[PDB]
Amino acid sequence: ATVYLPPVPVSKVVSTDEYVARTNIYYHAGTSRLLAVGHPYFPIKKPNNNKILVPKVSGLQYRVFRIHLPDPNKFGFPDTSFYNPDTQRLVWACVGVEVGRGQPLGVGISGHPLLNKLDDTENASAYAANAGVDNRECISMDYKQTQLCLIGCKPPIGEHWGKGSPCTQVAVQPGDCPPLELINTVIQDGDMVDTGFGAMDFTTLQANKSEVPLDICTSICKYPDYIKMVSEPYGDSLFFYLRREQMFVRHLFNRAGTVGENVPDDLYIKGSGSTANLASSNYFPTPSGSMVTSDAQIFNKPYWLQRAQGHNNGICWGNQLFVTVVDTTRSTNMSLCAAISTSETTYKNTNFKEYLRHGEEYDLQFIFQLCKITLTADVMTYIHSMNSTILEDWNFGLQPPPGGTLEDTYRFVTSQAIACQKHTPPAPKEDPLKKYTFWEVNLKEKFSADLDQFPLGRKFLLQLGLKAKPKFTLGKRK
Amino acid sequence: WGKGSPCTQVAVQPGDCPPLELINTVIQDGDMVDTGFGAMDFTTLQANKSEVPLDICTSICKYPDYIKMVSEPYGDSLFFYLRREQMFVRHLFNRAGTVGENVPDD
Amino acid sequence: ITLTADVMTYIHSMNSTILEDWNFGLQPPPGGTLEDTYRFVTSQAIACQKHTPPAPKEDPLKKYTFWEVNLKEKFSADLDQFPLGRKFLLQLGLKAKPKFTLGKRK
Amino acid sequence: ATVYLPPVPVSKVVSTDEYVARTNIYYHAGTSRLLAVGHPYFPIKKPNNNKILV
Amino acid sequence: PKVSGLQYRVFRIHLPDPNKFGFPDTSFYNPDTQRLVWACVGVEVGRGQPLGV
Amino acid sequence: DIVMSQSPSSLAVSVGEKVTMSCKSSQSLLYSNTQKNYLAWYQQKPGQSPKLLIYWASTRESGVPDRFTGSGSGTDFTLTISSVKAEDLAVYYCQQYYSYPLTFGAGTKLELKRA
Amino acid sequence: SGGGLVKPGGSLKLSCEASGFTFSSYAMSWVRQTPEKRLEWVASISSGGNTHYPDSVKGRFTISRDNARNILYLQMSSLRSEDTAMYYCARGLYYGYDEGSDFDYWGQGTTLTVS
């Protein structure tokens, strides 16, 4: 009739992996123990210089790790002689990850001496009309319970409400804010998380810019934009996630700041004097994520990625992984009293300068299965149609051309050695692959292979079978 | 986390917290568990020596180092552990004493 | 090199070091690693410090400075892309590989 | 040895569950209860001295 | 610097252990039986400078 | 860096004529993954600073006359003025904001012919 | 603000003060015009403080922002005669509806002469 229908269908996408036959060769890797000691509210800076003393690194902002893995294609192996570069390729698939959080319990305590607060509104105790001048208070807060983790192999997409349409393309005033329109963009390391007021920008969305704890008074806040990644017909943005989260209202409070909103006043029959006047309606709930418990860990636990949950079966492309972690239960603050100098005949608040630190621990334990790719000319035709770039990077076909063409003469320096001629002063640039910042994790020398050794290893080896078990554990009775 | 000692490469004076270095040691009788300030010494971190009780000031406070132990295959140092622990936030408070921190004033 | 005990032990009288690099045995449950090792810096900018990293090293075949030539990233199976390997091929006589031909030039 | 310290192990470390046989002979033990009565806050020492009384 | 041809040119060539080096086909080494070691079977000394002293 | 090549270097037309001008990039400005083109066009009148005309290859900035249309995809882009007006004499640039460094074309100078 | 005559090898610090809009909400950018009249990207800085420079000035120019006073800076060092140009301060805009970027506003420029 229309007809239309789409007709019927035009083209359609086959599974990513359904010709990739896994091999019995495994390799293994681990992590030494990554370390940062940051400060959660603000990077503590040098007092006459731009550059950090303590960086803002915390579990309350996204921890995005770029993990870059060995070339599997050319890699150390014990017996291979099947391999034909044109009719087969190799690729890593990681068959498990555990992530050790070596930090003890302890949340990220954050607060502002000047948090925007007018009156109590939970049970309340007074009335007030429109706001006076200067109603902010010293209040501190714990952020809502949020733990998630996601594993991908291409940076993942966040959403946030950004700064949308202007004041002139609507009829919304300056003092009422340009509209909040959901602007989607990739999650970057050092980006703040969802705050319990929604996940939004707060740089240009707080003109007071001291409504909330210091950390979130600037920068974008994101929430993972699961709908785009999972409706993706390739699903390389992610392919594994899990989360446990909750929030509750500690207490309702009202913002300070004059109503700019439109309250029709002829929807209540007038009081007398004070109750004929109109209060602030600028309610905000304060979130809480209190009661930490160690049966609420989504961490610390192996997740065998024999298959993924995406539309990608976890088989790497570009040989890299992205691991985004928020952990609010581990982001522990520390206390101690330190004297600036000795002069204490008594305790003095003067002399004893308290200073908080934050300790952030990460360790990543990996077990990799090697996989082969069966390829023929017809299959390849399809592989390029999905992603040109994967074949071109592997370049066991193809060509981009080998090279060639020259290597020489000669670069750089030029001269070397002895020389130190001129020094030579630069000479830019060579040669970076970044566009986003990421906490680099090199795995290209952490490679090992044993599964009778390494704890993570052993649980995988037992789960399988002979050779070898018992090699423990197992239990861990009772 | 033992006392990593104030460094003079990056500006940390007394009256700034030291960089902290993890110094691991054997679990021995009389020792305190984790308090949720982190698990660290308090005998020389504390200099008022009266932020916290008489008991934990004079102990090392420790978290179990499961991690190195479960990676010994033989497990002679342990071959059994379990845990149950929990804690809730009673009330936010401010410590006695003035900022030693550097606050960006912008 | 086949791993034969008579050859190995003879190599050991000549120089034990090639053997030690290959590594044989315990490591009683296992020492050095794992253990599980190691802690934990991984430098930032605070970082953990104090540091003074561990020392400078001298190579055991280095006593005096040389003009270092690293070759650890350039290996090709085929030898037809380079005039030195072709010349090796022709001299080799596999398979069977001209050699020369005339002319040259003339 | 030789070979060699041994081998192999390392790698793969031989379990003590392949040549260590259990027997059906059982003994039983226990303690007679243990009781220690302190003061959690501080030990109470005699302050004219240096030795604990609690 | 100070450099001439009237002065020693000492070059330190570094090579990986071959076992530790990957190849895409490797059924010629098993470490439970053998190790590997390089043999250099040809050296060509390229020169490319004018004549002069 | 991505080199932006504009053509012709200059052209002269009378009031009412249609003009087209080329901007070709040395690398693709089409992000395969989302099919967006990262191209903007600017107009610099004599003695003035460059004013934004087109961005995201074909989106016209508010206030820009509808006679200016930007088109193209990938590496080959065009700016068309449907009917040139006397006030359109200017140097037209194109600029890629796909990757760093952010780079500009060489520019096309548009001059007006008259009796 | 801040240009003028400077000798080769010297240093110079340019400033750009914003007005009429929320400075903290926009990326700011430096663009130069050499006598040949083509625009050249000088430096950019993200709202989070990540700097981006081309090889022509990387290691010599530094871009920075004062978020409290709302001032954009460009510290130049080891100035070369080739750095002679009109330097422009400019904003950047992100358009979420098309996922793109442009330079919507820029100043009158300040002249820097290395001679």
Q: How far is B19 from C48, CA to CA, in rounded Å? A: 6
Nearest to B10 among C30, C34, C46 (CB): C46
Q: Where are the beta strands (DSSP E) in A197-239?
A: 221-224
Contact A361/C40, CB-based, under 8 Å?
yes
Strand partners, F52: F42
Kindly give the pairing relationship between strand B32-33 and strand B61-62. Answer: parallel
- SS3 for A32-51 is CCEEEEECCCCCEECCCCCC
Q: How far is A394 from A404, CA to CA, in rounded Å? A: 17
Contact B45/A295, CB-based, under 8 Å?
no
Residue B1 contacts residue A359 (beta carbons within 8 Å): yes
Nearest to E25 among A83, A409, A421 (CB): A83
F/D Cβ contact: 3+ pairs below 8 Å: no
Is G38 at the interface with chain F, CB within 8 A? yes
Nearest to G59 among A185, A426, A437 (CB): A426
Contact A452/D13, CB-based, under 8 Å?
yes
Distance from CA of A59 to the nearest CA of B (A): 15
Is B22 at the interface with chain C, CB within 8 A? yes
> Which phi and psi angles does D9 have, rounded to 5°?
-95, 140
Q: How far is A410 from A427, CA to CA, in rounded Å? A: 13
Strand partners, A184: none
Sheet with F4-7: strands ordered across: F4-7, F19-25, F76-81, F68-73
Is B86 at the interface with chain A, CB within 8 A? yes
Contact A55/C38, CB-based, under 8 Å?
no
Q: How far is B29 from B38, CA to CA, in rounded Å? A: 20
Residue A189 contacts residue A437 (beta carbons within 8 Å): yes
Contact F32/A435, CB-based, under 8 Å?
no
Residue A182 contacts residue A283 (beta carbons within 8 Å): no
Short-list A150, A185, A205, CA closest to A436: A185
Rounded to 5°, the CA angle G111-A49-C50 comes to 145
Nearest to A453 among D11, D15, D17 (CB): D11
Nearest CA in chain C to D6: C25
Contact A435/F99, CB-based, under 8 Å?
yes
Residue E16 contacts residue E22 (beta carbons within 8 Å): no
Short-list A100, F97, A56, D4, CA closest to C40: A100
Residue A361 contacts residue A334 (beta carbons within 8 Å): no
Residue G47's CB is within 10 A of a number of other CB atoms, namely 20
Is A74 at the interface with chain F, CB within 8 A? no
Contact D15/A453, CB-based, under 8 Å?
no
> What resolution (Å)?
12.0
Contact B4/C48, CB-based, under 8 Å?
yes
Exposure b/e, A21-41, CB count within 10 A at least 16 = b = eeeebbbbbbbbbbbbbbbbb
DSSP conformation letters of C64-77? S--EEEE-SS---S
**Which H/E stretch holds residue G75?**
strand G71-76
Chains contacting chain F through 3 or more C-beta pairs under 8 A:
A, G
- Give residues with Cβ within 8 angstroms of C103, minimum separation 6: none
Helix (H, G, I), strand (E, B) or coil at D49: coil
Distance from CA of A232 to the nearest CA of F (A): 10
> Which phi and psi angles does A327 have, rounded to 5°?
-145, 115
Q: Where are the beta strands (DSSP E) in A231-385?
A: 240-246, 248-254, 283-288, 292-293, 320-327, 333-334, 337-339, 352-354, 357-374
Chain A to chain E Cβ contacts (< 8 Å): 40
Which of A26, A458, A471, A473 is the best substitution to test chain D (most D C-beta atoms within 10 A)? A471
Residue holding tokens 């393309």?
A: A169
Short-list G114, G99, G83, G94, CA closest to G29: G94
- Show residues of chain A in contact with B12, CB under 8 Å: 53
Q: In one letter, which amino acid is A113?
A: P
Residue G35 contacts residue G43 (beta carbons within 8 Å): no
Short-list F34, G91, E42, CA closest to A204: G91
- Show residues of chain E in contact with A77, CB under 8 Å: 22-23, 26
Distance from CA of G115 to the nearest CA of B (A): 39
- Show residues of chain G in contact with A158, CB under 8 Å: none
Contact A355/B17, CB-based, under 8 Å?
yes
Torsion of CA G33, G36, G41, G42, to 10 degrees: -60
Burial of D30 (0-12, 13-18, 19+ CB in 10 A): exposed
Kindly give the pairing relationship between strand G100-106 and strand G85-95. Answer: antiparallel
Helix (H, G, I), strand (E, B) or coil at A228: helix
Q: In one letter, which amino acid is C90?
A: L
Q: How far is A182 from G99, CA to CA, in rounded Å? A: 12
Contact A352/B96, CB-based, under 8 Å?
yes
- Show residues of chain E in contact with A73, CB under 8 Å: 24
- Show residues of chain D in contact with C5, CB under 8 Å: 2-4
Torsion of CA F74, F76, F82, F88, to 10 degrees: 110
Chains contacting chain C through 3 or more C-beta pairs under 8 A:
A, B, D, E
DSSP conformation letters of E21-46? S-BS--TT--TTTB------------
Q: Residue A224's Cα: distance from chain center in Å?
A: 9
- From its phi and psi, is residue A344 left (phi > 0), alpha (psi between -120 and 50) or beta? beta
Contact F100/A388, CB-based, under 8 Å?
no
Is C69 at the interface with chain E, CB within 8 A? yes
Chains contacting chain B through 3 or more C-beta pairs under 8 A:
A, C, D, G
DSSP conformation letters of A135-191? -EEEEEE---EEEEEEEESS--EEE-EEE-S-SSSSS--STT-S-EEE--EE--TTP
Chain A to chain G Cβ contacts (< 8 Å): 36
Contact C26/D3, CB-based, under 8 Å?
no
Contact F99/A388, CB-based, under 8 Å?
no
Is F106 at the interface with chain G, CB within 8 A? yes
Residue A27 contacts residue A368 (beta carbons within 8 Å): yes
Q: How far is E4 from E47, CA to CA, in rounded Å? A: 14
Sheet with A352-354: strands ordered across: A337-339, A352-354, B98-99
Contact G67/B105, CB-based, under 8 Å?
no
- Give residues with Cβ within 8 angstroms of A238, minimum separation 6: A150, A151, A152, A156, A229, A230, A310
Nearest CA in chain B to D17: B74
Is C42 at the interface with chain B, CB within 8 A? no
CA atoms within 13 A on the CB side of B19: 24
Residue holding tokens 């912008």?
A: B106
Q: Residue A4's Cα: distance from chain center in Å?
A: 43
Is D11 at the interface with chain A, CB within 8 A? yes
Largest CA distance in chain E: 55
Contact B21/C46, CB-based, under 8 Å?
no
Q: How far is A307 from A235, CA to CA, in rounded Å? A: 13
- Show residues of chain C in contact with E13, CB under 8 Å: 69, 71
Contact B10/C35, CB-based, under 8 Å?
no
- From its phi and psi, is residue A439 left (phi > 0), alpha (psi between -120 and 50) or beta? beta
Residue B104 contacts residue A52 (beta carbons within 8 Å): no
Q: How far is D54 from D45, CA to CA, in rounded Å? A: 7
Chains contacting chain A through 3 or more C-beta pairs under 8 A:
B, C, D, E, F, G
Residue A365 contacts residue A26 (beta carbons within 8 Å): no
CA atoms within 13 A on the CB side of A7: 4
